Design a protein around this ligand. Structure first.
Ligand SMILES: NC(=O)c1ccc[n+]([C@@H]2O[C@H](COP(=O)([O-])OP(=O)(O)OC[C@H]3O[C@@H](n4cnc5c(N)ncnc54)[C@H](OP(=O)(O)O)[C@@H]3O)[C@@H](O)[C@H]2O)c1
Ligand SMILES: [Zn+2]
Ligand SMILES: [Zn+2]
Ligand SMILES: [Zn+2]
Ligand SMILES: [Zn+2]
Lengths: 353, 353
């Protein structure tokens, strides 16, 4: 009934061992030994309270690959030994229009995996995958295809589904279509990977000239634009069918909309604290479209994993021990990872002795 | 892995939560969820460093009852779900004369359950039953009969085997035999219970007249003798087939030997710091015998449990939570318990949250 993770106690975001009372496995619950957990920039936003919604102490982590060690009496979707994943949320109300039409990810009572409010269990705060053992409803766990490496698959549970889902939603998943990806980070590099697997033409828009070689080589993007180079950006005006914006800091979207063809679709998935400034003319003139996307439904996540397993899509990762997590967080803040940190949780000393 | 117990850090003996590295279940090892652990004066002597051999931090506990939760691939003597006990020691060299003949309790390289030196694992210190999970060689685990309460059985693993083994060895084990028990603490009350289960007539011998009602009421002894009453002692001269001497305070042995019939047997299980004064004539004249013993072999312990299960022999206990342990120890220093504390380990919060 005691679980063990690493938590932040205040806005410094400094992580250190934390023991806490864990939820007991109920009839519909699955017990998961955490093997790997990706570090998402959302975890950094939360532990530093950049959105103002941190409930300290915070146990981060919501890109989880693990193995089932026990299931409740009512569980039928999983059994001990199954390789499974947990993403950004672990529960929902189950009844509202969103929950009833397969869009539980937009439920107003969503229970986040990390720093969420467990409405079905006395409103306790949820502790994420920076911990040894999770207890999750069978209806919010996904199966990891055996063809995927467990560490390279972990960032798919948030980074991957968040970019995969809008590509399917907005028909930005067909050969010949031209997609822009803004911010070649965790989400961004997954967008490039999935877009190229769909056969799309991909332009990367980046503030980091040093990412050019890997973007055009390893990742296979077709073009690379430096966003603070007015000449490069102007040359690409009105060339894109769609653009996925993953930028985590405040930024201007007018130059990004300028890259879209008339009627083109911008998908915002980055979540900076500073509001985006949208002049009306920048969407009126060419009938352009802006949409937000939040991860995917559980079924969306499973479909993304099935696709990744069939096409060999995995994140480019740097695997680290938990004792390195504060250095990893600092490097993520400094934009110094290619392109996702993954914590080897099961191989780390989680408790201090 | 990491295990969780309560440990002393210095000679104050004050116990508080303590996490430590646990050794891995090997091929011949058994994993035991600790349910109950008795407390006895040996634990107090260790944690207060009164023998100068405390290796801090010290996790006490050597009267352990638990349930098997996992076994190594080569284990044949136990399976998950078995109710088991662990006594004073958990390993031995296995090769010496004592070990090879089933008397490993006399191994010079004995591995104690608490504050022992695990010679087979880099001499690491052993942590006792004041903890949540133990890993022990299958050859040093005993089976607790289901006919016994798990908490009342725990002190049998120390005091019970200490008094049972000599009763069986020296034929002080049949109706019509008259047994004296010197002292009325943990060991004394155990000796009376086993003696009664054998059908013997039991005389409690004490230097404190105040223990009379205790001996004749609660415990149901047949007679009570004040060791200072010269006339009453003289009237009982040469009436006892055996005596179990449990007293740890300095005391004269000659008056107790006088109670023995010729060829009678005295068994010393308490250890006074002052040597016993034994005039040769006191044993020569009537061919009397004096022997000592502590806890027995694994086989001794199992034979004691089998007998106890067949006759309903259980210790008189007071069950306490771990967070009360320091108060229990203070009370035990004054012998303010009837007659043994047992910690409800599985029912206690062992970690800090
Ligand atoms: N919508 C959802 O459901 C969802 C899911 C997951 C994450 N997110 C959010 O998406 C964002 C990205 O997450 P992530 O894990 O991918 O983060 P990340 O790895 O840090 O990548 C973000 C990227 O944004 C770009 N960037 C950063 N600072 C910038 C600046 N000052 N100006 C311009 N560009 C900048 C960088 O790319 P370049 O170096 O190429 O410029 C950087 O690599 C975060 O806000 C996070 O909370 C949202
Ligand atoms: Zn995320
Ligand atoms: Zn809902
Ligand atoms: Zn003992
Ligand atoms: Zn030996």
């Amino acid at each position: 009934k005691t679980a063990h993770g690493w938590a932040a106690r205040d806005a410094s975001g400094h992580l250190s061992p934390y023991s806490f009372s864990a939820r007991i496995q109920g009839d519909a619950d699955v017990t998961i030994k955490v093997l790997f957990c990706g570090i998402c920039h959302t975890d950094l936003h939360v532990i530093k309270n950049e959105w103002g919604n941190a409930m300290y102490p915070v146990v981060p982590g919501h890109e989880v690959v693990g193995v089932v060690t026990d299931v409740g009496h009512g569980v039928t979707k999983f059994k001990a030994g199954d390789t499974v994943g947990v993403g950004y949320f672990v529960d929902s109300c189950r009844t509202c229009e969103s929950c009833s039409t397969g869009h539980e990810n937009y439920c107003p009572d969503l229970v986040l995996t990390s720093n969420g409010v467990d409405h079905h269990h006395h409103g306790a705060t949820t502790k994420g995958g920076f911990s040894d053992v999770l207890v999750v409803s069978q209806d919010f766990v996904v199966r990891v295809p055996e063809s995927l490496p467990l560490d390279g698959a972990a960032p798919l549970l948030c980074a991957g589904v968040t970019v995969y889902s809008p590509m399917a939603q907005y028909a930005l998943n067909e050969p010949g279509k031209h997609l822009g990806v803004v911010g070649l980070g965790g989400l961004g590099h997954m967008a490039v990977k999935f877009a190229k697997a769909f056969g799309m033409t991909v332009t990367v828009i980046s503030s980091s000239p040093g990412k050019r070689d890997e973007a055009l080589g390893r990742l296979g993007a077709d073009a690379f634009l430096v966003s603070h180079d007015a000449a490069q950006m102007k040359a690409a005006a009105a060339t894109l069918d769609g653009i996925i914006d993953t930028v985590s800091a405040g930024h201007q979207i007018v130059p990004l909309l300028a890259l879209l063809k008339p009627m083109g679709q911008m998908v915002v998935v980055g979540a900076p604290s500073t509001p985006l400034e949208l002049p009306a003319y920048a969407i009126i003139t060419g009938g352009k479209r802006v949409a937000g996307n939040g991860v995917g439904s559980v079924a969306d996540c499973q479909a993304m994993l099935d696709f990744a397993g069939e096409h060999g899509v995995t994140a480019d990762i740097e695997v680290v021990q938990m004792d390195y997590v504060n250095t990893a967080i600092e490097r993520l803040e400094k934009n110094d990872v290619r392109y996702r940190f993954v914590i080897d949780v099961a191989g780390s000393k989680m408790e201090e002795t």
